[PDB]
Ligand binder design. Structure first.
Ligand SMILES: *O[C@H]1[C@@H](O)[C@H](n2cnc3c(=O)[nH]c(N)nc32)O[C@@H]1COP(=O)(O)OP(=O)(O)OP(=O)(O)O
Ligand SMILES: *O[C@H]1[C@@H](O)[C@H](n2cnc3c(=O)[nH]c(N)nc32)O[C@@H]1COP(=O)(O)OP(=O)(O)OP(=O)(O)O
Ligand SMILES: [Mg+2]
Ligand SMILES: [Mg+2]
Ligand SMILES: [Mg+2]
Ligand SMILES: [Mg+2]
Ligand SMILES: [Zn+2]
Ligand SMILES: [Zn+2]
Ligand SMILES: [Zn+2]
Lengths: 646, 638, 647
RNA sequence: AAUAUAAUAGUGAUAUUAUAUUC
RNA sequence: AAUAUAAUAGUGAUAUUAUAUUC
């Protein structure tokens, strides 16, 4: 092929064998850079020797793409390309697969798990490592675990040969740094994490690069929240009523429609779970009632937020679908609350259909769309929003707007079209259709994602609007821009340093961090038998004596006493994780409780339930004390390993 | 030598089309003008010759352009001349224009000469070039010239008209809230210059982008200081207001400034059967409102700068004054005095804005010690304030500040610069301190940042300023898109629309033209401060329809002459002295003393006088044009 | 994914575990059929068992395509996909690579070689085999070798489990059959070769299939040969004068035909064995004769080229030839011949610059292109010709023609010795279906003679409704060949539809019979005295058979520093790595700038060694003196000493 | 080096050339 | 003396102030 000069320039520090973090704008063709570095690396070895390259892709789509491209590129040169992902990782000779292939594409967790398991004895088997989106190397992220192994081998007493390390990123990030010095420290710490002595950027060839990747012009639209809202009043009345019904069965202990009230109502929901009675099949009644109350309050709050960021109709549809899910499941207070909702449904719908009441944010958004599509009818737009509810909401709003009829919206979420509505995309991901219009709707993110989003605006004349009713959002974007300045300046300063000095600084950052990392014990396990009841209906589910732990992670149940406590519905999203294969979802079997207990999976020969401690209440039969645990790791008792021999 | 995009910009003009040339500041528009003029002059046959006039709105640009054109076209058979305010008097401008091929002018010369009748028609020029043509609008001299032009075009004069070439970095969208309105405004501007073509760099854009780089803009939002100082001055405002209230909407805002000015007006129109008693009731209220005003300004300065700057402002004010109620006011000021001073030097209380500014300067100069910085502030008071602040800050010791108002210097503090102006030594750092301006000035300030890597910060605690700047950016988008649309139109249809707009505007312009009958009742001018008898309206003679003088030995009594702080020669006059009231150290500013021809005469402004009259009452007039009486022409015979 | 009904219909017999030959039109999307069959095959097994699929792609582009598609598709299902091609086949644990992967894409030669070595012990390791373009399974083709192994295991007493066999083709072919019954025999024999009991075709869903793949209309253009050859009139004089020069030294049929080519080749081979007591004189006259016959051959080629194309193209062919000759060096004979050619050059270029002489075939072709592009300017054309010389010829003819200016020609050939802007693609031929290229709504066959299979396969370029295919020829036989090929297609479809009606059991019995018969048929002294290897051109001593060593029972090298003085070398124009060898340079005869091609120079393991072909040499027995010529090293019979690194 | 297809010569095993592919 | 820009007040013409320029 025909590489651009800045690509050769970026690859040059790596082709000289130096561990290198390559920092270049999104969409500059880093793929061919990787191909160049890899080709040169593999061809440099004499006849009696051969190298082994490992490419780390953090996402399955990137995994498949890179595997495909590398395979098509290097097959002719006599280099075997393969890959190992979560799907193909089980019951396979991973060591042999690594050994028998020259280029191997991995998702990092495979290498982490296989290093920890011992199947891959050392990283010395690889002569080269490439980290895609290498800014992810930090904290507990798998990249950083791999690099922990690397640095432990390097700084350790007996150290074999180590692979060259090449990172790839659009932005290294400054962290929380408030000034260029702190930024410099963050960047140096990142370089220390990847053992990189060189940061490669485009300097000599800048004009060529700027003819390829163009920087989109960014505008900030500051609008105001709706002052016309009568919907919030009614829904607030409902919230007060339900609060009173919760205040009926309890005694005592800030604003409606905010995050703070969400925290409050969640914590309260937790509080109602620890309350106990001496006659406890009234507990099944009371705590279930309180659970339903707090849940409905939560949903109402969510509706208020949705109405704040979108149409009132979207909030009413949210609630309607919610109460639709309440039915087709005949509860208790549920019919009561449903009726109470239908009381105000007519008034609410009367308010939602009033054109005078419409959201000014959507008005301004519609304005932007209208103008830009009037000037350029061929415009491809991408619209980022915070939550999936907003995705569906703006989908329906665009489809239901006569003004926007020129739009043909589409959906992009987690787990033909003019405009694509999405939540967020981790890092760069696979290149999609170029968008000359990017709209950030109440969006807040870091500097890295800011720089990465520009990659959708690569063409000249691309535009990016940030639309919000909050000033904090805007100034967050601005401090992110300043952060970008600090980043570039700190990098430019580092590049002026002597390579040896930087190597040593990196060395002591590594050594210090390793001392700290080795400095960081074993908690005393309690053998007292507990009871696991339901967080909703407080019904007896398990005893901790019946609970076994599989692979130091998952928890299952043995006794047949549990088989009468649960029902099962076919899993909405069946998938196989590790050695487990998801089959069904598990719910409480008592009196339509239908609380989510966990999943039902196929493990080897056995088919067993797996439960989450997040879904249950802990009962100490000795002290009668009830407590709540978020993660199984925070629950300290005696966990008996799963034994197939029983 | 020529860069392609300059040829591209000059092409529509070279084809004889009236053209608005729109390109980024500092792309070398001068050579574009040179190309256009050269081709225009050399295109004529043997029996004919061209005459080009170049309008520069500012004297530095005037001199620069005159010099460059002179050096360039002397080689060829074309004579280059120029006429500015200094050389415009007692010279046959008609012959000067007639005897030269290229004439560089400040627009007021051509306006005045068109009215005077010395230049009968614009038909004498075959080419006109407006520098910073975005200024052609409203009552600006450019627009006056173009009013003459359009008056000839739409009329039955049927004389030949000059090709019109405008030059600007931004045409502006005006007040437009959307792309359609922007399109309307731009079409009206094209109509004002009678231009059928907007020339911008398109084919060669990538060549233009390696010359002029767009500096990165950051926005710094801080918070206001949290203020015992303000709390102290508040009572001075209150009790001074009580002193005013004894003889007869909050503090620190320009609203209160409006308030105090329009209080002072009413204090000037108060009247009484006696004479003396009002003289110093009005003197008292005058000084009360004045000192109140100065206190207000002091609070504002304390908000935008150090407390020491405000204290120095007040101290200088009280130093410039004396008596008795000045002694009272001063004494009351000396009571708080210190607690002012003691609060001021408390490091605790420092302005966060200045802290953030100092941070910015610190970082940028730490990374690049060779940095050149330019700092824009709203008022001269802030210029001096930040001057002393920079020179008085240990952290800023690397800074060697300088002053630019209306190497040896690392940072240059300025107020504002009209349009692009003459080229300066360019700053890789531009800081806008509480700056609010339009889209045009925004684009023009980029000219200081042409080098790659230049940065521009906008520092404010107001947060409405930020919104203003960003909607200005959106305005730029609207501008470029509207232009991009106009460029796609068919030229004929566009010329038709332009014609319609021209006729429309001329109809409205002719619709607005009054002239009330002059009141012959003899009037009386009093000093606005001390209400002293100053003049009779029958002593006032008018010189050249503009300047008003006074006769009689009686008026020579009433005013004192002091040498002018800034002597300057305007028109046929010469500023020498300054005129003040002679009463009881009132010394209100009445006007100036000038030398006109062989005469030494006083010139007064109606703005400093109040018009009382005998039969009936008083009124105030800001300008002489608003004051209607019988105005007797100045006769050299006394 | 949303599979079409006929794809499920085609995949259904295979999903039932039946060995199946899948016969469907080219471009119906057979890849999805393969994906369905493989997915079902892999997901059918219980927990304690797992399947292993092997896919056979005959060409590297298809190899990479299929590997990519299968990898992208089956990764999410938990099945590892890999491949082994010629490039990656060396110095790798093939057995482990096969064992550790669920789906393996392979070029058949890899499997044949690995079975022959014994690295892969049995075909029992695969539960499913898929042959792409399975009509190639016959004779000595690698597919058929694999199936020889398969059937040897089936008919033997090994009693090991065998994989399900699924073939894929657009046409099974009738072979040489003159009638339907014989066609039935051929098809049955093919089914016996693939051990297939079922032939799957689209029947119920045909109405759906015909809305995807459309049959292009075929037109037959029969034109006239050019009426008068001035060019051949004068060049027959150069052939006559050259064979008269040959007629001086000899002491011992139509021009412009293949008969003359055969004759001049046999003559050239006859001149190499002539011997004299004086060996240097012998070398002189043998070089002379070789050169004469060579120039004769080139002239003949020119005649043919100008028969099928412009006379300018033939003239330029000869000019290119003599350019190369001039580049070779100054030989007395070559200088002479070139001189006599240059004498007639003026007259010649005089005769092809005339517009009057343009051949009727190119005129008719020009008419076709003109009309079709007049009706549809967006037309994409593909032009098939027999030889690469004609590819260059028509390539230059198109852009050298003012009327054809709307055409943007392109070149498609082999490697060896709509939205884009190429409107027309000139090509020689493409093996089987190959990777799908841009759809051509115009297909021009210029003097093309194929078989029924290639005819059916070329329709895949015409899938769109309204596609057209012209057959333009002056021979008048070609028409008949294509027609009888159409009849062959009818015979094929009819015989297939007849076979589908049989009871499957009976068919299995007939198949077993044929297989056993074929196995019965299939199961049915070297000279030790030294020989000399002489140059076929200059008769110079190159090697002795005692110095020749045989590597891997295939390639032949030479030992000793003596041979290093007999040849020169220049870097290989097309460097290529075959097997364990890496091509470096070409070796030529070093004596008096003979420059005859002896072979190649390669890197084998640690060694840098020459490899020679017996085709370029003459074998002289030291004892008898008798000189002989040999086809390939296989037919040369002497005791061949294996290459020993320790020697 | 092997393989396939096509034309030509031969009754045919084959042979020559052309074309393509693979190792 | 004229003019332009910006902020504030007014629904607007305008008005005040700030800044800059020109004759
Ligand atoms: O005898 C042959 C053979 O030993 C060796 N050879 C050349 N190419 C190959 C190949 O692709 N595969 C195998 N197994 N063996 C090969 O070369 C000898 C003959 O040399 P050539 O002059 O014919 O080879 P060359 O490269 O010059 O021509 P070509 O291979 O392009 O056709
Ligand atoms: O009414 C004005 C006018 O008659 C005269 N005047 C002063 N400067 C100019 C000038 O630049 N151009 C013209 N045409 N006329 C001028 O003075 C009268 C007002 O006197 P001021 O006190 O306001 O002017 P002064 O010089 O004292 O102050 P400043 O103008 O520099 O700020
Ligand atoms: Mg990169
Ligand atoms: Mg090697
Ligand atoms: Mg992890
Ligand atoms: Mg202006
Ligand atoms: Zn329950
Ligand atoms: Zn006075
Ligand atoms: Zn030789």
């Amino acid at each position: 092929f025909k590489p651009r000069n800045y690509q050769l320039e970026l690859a040059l520090p790596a082709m000289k064998g130096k561990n290198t973090i390559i920092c270049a704008p999104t969409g500059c063709g880093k793929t061919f850079v990787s191909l160049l570095i890899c080709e040169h690396h593999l061809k440099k070895f004499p006849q009696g020797q051969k190298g082994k390259v490992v490419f780390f892709a953090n996402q399955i789509p990137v995994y498949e793409q890179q595997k495909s491209v590398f395979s098509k590129y290097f097959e002719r040169h006599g280099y075997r390309v393969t890959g190992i992902s979560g799907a193909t990782a089980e019951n396979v000779p991973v060591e042999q697969i690594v050994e028998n292939n020259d280029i191997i594409i991995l998702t990092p967790q495979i290498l982490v798990n296989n290093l920890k398991k011992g199947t891959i004895p050392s990283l010395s088997i690889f002569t080269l490592m490439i980290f895609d989106e290498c800014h992810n190397t930090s904290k507990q992220h798998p990249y950083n675990m791999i690099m922990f192994n690397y640095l432990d081998q390097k700084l350790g007493g007996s150290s074999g040969p180590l692979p060259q390390v090449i990172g790839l990123t659009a932005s290294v990030g400054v962290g929380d740094a408030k000034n260029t010095d702190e930024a410099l420290d963050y960047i140096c710490k990142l370089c220390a994490s990847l053992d990189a002595s060189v940061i490669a950027t485009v300097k000599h060839n800048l004009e060529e690069l700027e003819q390829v990747v163009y920087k989109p012009q960014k505008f900030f639209r500051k609008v105001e929240s709706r002052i016309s809202d009568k919907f919030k009043y009614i829904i607030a009345q409902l919230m007060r009523d339900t609060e009173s019904l919760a205040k009926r069965i309890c005694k005592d202990l800030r604003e409606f429609g905010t995050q703070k009230y969400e925290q409050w109502i969640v914590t309260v929901q937790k509080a109602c779970m620890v309350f106990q009675m001496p006659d406890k099949d009234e507990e099944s009644r009371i705590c279930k009632a309180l659970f339903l109350y707090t849940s409905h309050l939560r949903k109402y709050n969510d509706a208020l937020i949705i109405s704040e960021h979108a149409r009132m109709k979207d909030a009413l549809d949210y609630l309607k679908d919610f109460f639709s899910n309440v039915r087709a499941a005949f509860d208790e207070i549920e019919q009561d609350l449903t009726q109470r909702f239908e009381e105000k449904l007519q008034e609410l719908e009367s308010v939602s259909r009033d054109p005078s009441n419409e959201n000014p944010k959507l008005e301004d958004l519609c304005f932007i769309l209208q103008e830009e599509y009037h000037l350029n009818p061929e415009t491809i737009t991408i619209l980022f929003v915070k939550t999936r509810a907003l995705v569906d909401a703006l989908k329906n709003w665009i489809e239901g707007n006569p003004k926007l009829s020129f739009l043909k919206p589409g959906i992009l979420t987690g787990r033909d079209h003019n405009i694509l509505i999405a939540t967020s995309v981790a890092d760069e991901g696979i290149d999609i259709a170029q968008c000359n219009l990017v709209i950030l709707y109440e969006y807040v993110g870091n500097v890295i994602k800011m720089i990465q989003t520009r990659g959708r605006g690569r063409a000249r004349g691309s535009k990016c609007f940030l639309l919000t009713s909050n000033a904090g959002v805007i100034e967050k974007e601005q401090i992110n821009m300043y952060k970008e300045k600090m980043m570039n300046d700190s990098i430019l300063r580092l590049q002026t340093w002597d390579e040896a000095v930087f190597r040593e600084k990196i060395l002591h950052i590594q050594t210090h961090e390793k001392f700290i990392r080795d400095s960081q014990p074993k908690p005393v396990p309690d053998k007292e038998n507990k009871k696991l009841l339901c967080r909703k209906c407080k019904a007896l589910a398990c005893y901790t004596a019946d609970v076994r732990v599989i692979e130091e992670c998952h928890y299952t149940v043995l006794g047949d006493a549990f088989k009468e406590c649960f029902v099962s519905r076919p899993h909405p999203k069946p998938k196989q994780f590790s050695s487990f294969e998801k089959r069904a979802k598990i719910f409480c079997a008592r009196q339509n409780c239908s609380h989510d207990w966990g999943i039902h999976v196929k493990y080897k020969t056995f088919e067993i339930p797996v439960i989450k401690i997040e879904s249950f209440v802990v009962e100490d039969i000795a002290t009668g004390v009830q407590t709540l645990y978020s993660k199984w790791k925070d629950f300290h008792f005696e966990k008996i390993p799963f034994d197939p021999a029983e």
